[PDB]
Amino acid sequence: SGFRKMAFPSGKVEGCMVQVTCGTTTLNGLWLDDVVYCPRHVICTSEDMLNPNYEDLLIRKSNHNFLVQAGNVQLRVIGHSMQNCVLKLKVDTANPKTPKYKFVRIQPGQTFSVLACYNGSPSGVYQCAMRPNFTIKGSFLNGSCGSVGFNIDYDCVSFCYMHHMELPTGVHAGTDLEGNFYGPFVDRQTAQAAGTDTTITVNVLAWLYAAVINGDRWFLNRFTTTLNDFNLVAMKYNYEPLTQDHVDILGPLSAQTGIAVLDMCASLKELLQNGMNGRTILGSALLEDEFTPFDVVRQCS
Amino acid sequence: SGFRKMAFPSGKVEGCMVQVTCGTTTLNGLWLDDVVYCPRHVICTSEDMLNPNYEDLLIRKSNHNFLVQAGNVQLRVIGHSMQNCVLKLKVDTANPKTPKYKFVRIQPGQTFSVLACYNGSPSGVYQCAMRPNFTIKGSFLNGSCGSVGFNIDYDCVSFCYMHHMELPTGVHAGTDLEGNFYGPFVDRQTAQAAGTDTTITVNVLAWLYAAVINGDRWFLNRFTTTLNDFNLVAMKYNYEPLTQDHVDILGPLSAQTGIAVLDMCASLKELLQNGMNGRTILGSALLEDEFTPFDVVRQCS
Ligand SMILES: *C(=N)[C@H](CCS(C)(=O)=O)NC(=O)[C@H](CC1CC1)NC(=O)c1cc2c(OC)cccc2[nH]1
Ligand SMILES: *C(=N)[C@H](CCS(C)(=O)=O)NC(=O)[C@H](CC1CC1)NC(=O)c1cc2c(OC)cccc2[nH]1
């Protein structure tokens, strides 16, 4: 038993991290087979960054302007191209540590592991959720761009995030591995705001089940609610709507605990309307929304 | 920026995880050079577990009663011995993925990453701390014994924990890699109680320094204290007393902020005496105690 924020083991991804240098800019890249993926703003000077015309800037580069380092070994760049905000450097060497992998675009509310990397060297791993406003609350320092987020399923790594940006509020923005930003962000050097964020309701409910499985039950009550009446209250509090698909994916946790999904919704509605009254759930003073139902099932079954 | 519970990248440890089976019992082992380390209760039947005579049980075992597997690949066992609560199996293959490593015995308050493994297969990685009562608030399911906790310092893995048991309250107990339990626990199938837990004072102070570094400093006051007066008050609030080593490891944070250690102690003491008065620190109403001063230095520099 027990419940922790848990990331996927990172070794399959660690074997793919390299360092990419262009000019005086150094960031991380992802080496799969014979291609290195990295943020295209590596080609920018600080002047370019303000309003970069990326196609022009890239045409002016040669293969030799890119220095790729895997460990102590320089990889020779024999081609380059651009897919949206991601630069692809073809190298003359295939990565022997390439795992089975896919590039996927995740949905808001879904979680993934982030391998934070500096100068091509992995430094830490932690778990994140894509927020409804398409930011992530990460932990990143200068030189972290090109760090990736991923999930692992059997032996296949699904890469879903590459890091590009920190907003003035301190949350983070990035792209999928096809180079498309999550959210309304652009890779230029400007202060950018996100839309108003909301709370991931199906995740809060999954975490309330995790708390029950681990013996926290002070927040339960004898009541049930309708799904529509629950959603009226949830929206009032800036929570995302709960769909019937969400009710279904919570099925295994309802089964395990014997607590119907709409019974647990009546508890969540009482917590929104009354607060926690100085108490905690799983050691948290706040309702936690970055565990999906699958995360909880994986950990508690 | 951003401030998160972060685990170390787990690849170096993943390359060392194997499974060890004796009879029908399978747990995890750690394969370093040509030795596999694992919990000695793998040799027990359920009848043995209530009051095992490990010396006598081991004398009756031979090398050929132990099945060690890397994946489905058997490693032949060619010697065996017991060191306290850890079994050491010498195998005929030196692990080519052995990292530089050390075995260390950590102090209460120190944090580490846990790689949760089942049948020798890594499932997840998370960060936790050793509590003052020598338990960890981990996350483990059946078959997790032998999972290890570790820190990584440059390219060197310091192994500090091997998982052995879950107490009735749902917290976890285990050994260092020399087989010595943290705390007064024994590897038999009995209900064992941990001492009343306390708050890790050096870690709370590290987190207050993190708050100051980030501009959240309303709690700083114009007082100081002696170390002994602070320790005496700390104990009255179920906080651990500070050691000289705690004062030393807070030094870099003291220097960076300009706030003397004992001045920060006086600030914490006022917080404990008076409460938060409806204010928060780093967005939280609760004082965090599972970030060490090293963790803060890593994420705030
Ligand atoms: C990547 N290595 C780096 C992020 C580092 S972090 C702070 O997330 O650890 N990316 C950047 O520095 C981007 C580069 C731009 C092409 C996207 N820039 C920003 O993240 C950035 C710029 C600004 C500005 O510019 C005026 C104002 C406020 C915030 C901000 N963030
Ligand atoms: C190892 N794979 C397993 C821990 C799995 S967990 C629950 O942490 O995910 N270890 C055990 O089951 C140990 C084996 C003993 C040599 C140590 N036993 C316990 O953890 C254990 C036994 C008991 C009893 O026994 C009556 C009562 C209450 C709690 C308890 N815990």
In which range does the helix fraction of chain A lie?
A: 10-25%
Known CATH architecture of the domain at 201-300 in chain A? Orthogonal Bundle
The largest interface is: A-B, 38 and 37 residues
**CATH topology of the domain at 201-300 in chain A, anyone?**
main proteinase (3clpro) structure, domain 3
Assembly level: homodimer
**Number of separate helices of chain A:** 8
Biggest sheet: strand arrangement of chain A: 5-4-1-2-3-7-6
Biggest β-sheet strands, sense, barrel of chain A: 7 strands, antiparallel
The outline of chain A comes out as elongated
CATH superfamily of the domain at 201-300 in chain A: main proteinase (3clpro) structure, domain 3
Bound compounds, each kind once, are: the ligand *C(=N)[C@H](CCS(C)(=O)=O)NC(=O)[C@H](CC1CC1)NC(=O)c1cc2c(OC)cccc2[nH]1
Radius of gyration of chain A: 22 Å
Q: Structural class of the helices, strands and pairings of chain A?
A: alpha+beta
Number of strands of chain A: 13
| String of helices and strands of chain A | HEEEHEEEEEEEEEEHHHHHH
Name the CATH class of the domain at 201-300 in chain A: Mainly Alpha
Strand content of chain A: 25-35%
Distance between the termini of chain A: 9 Å
